[PDB]
């Protein structure tokens, strides 16, 4: 349905302290929404940190 989901369009990996390494292709759900950076949870190891919005895909589903 409608949510906060979005898709990492590119590889990265954590490097502050709340962080969160994805890939290219990968799915993560959103926490909260700031503006530069979002704190989101990748639901492929249950995780949540950071995710550069300007490299990631918003999706509601």
């Given at each position: 349905?409608?949510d906060?989901?979005?898709?990492?369009?590119?590889?990265?990996?954590?490097?502050?302290?709340?962080?969160?390494?994805?890939?290219?292709?990968?799915?993560?759900?959103?926490?909260?929404?700031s503006?530069?950076?979002?704190?989101?949870r990748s639901?492929?190891?249950?995780?949540?940190?950071?995710?550069?919005?300007?490299?990631?895909?918003?999706?509601?589903?």
């Amino acid at each position: 349905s409608e949510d906060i989901i979005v898709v990492a369009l590119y590889d990265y990996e954590a490097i502050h302290h709340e962080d969160l390494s994805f890939q290219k292709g990968d799915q993560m759900v959103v926490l909260e929404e700031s503006g530069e950076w979002w704190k989101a949870r990748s639901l492929a190891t249950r995780k949540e940190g950071y995710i550069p919005s300007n490299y990631v895909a918003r999706v509601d589903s």
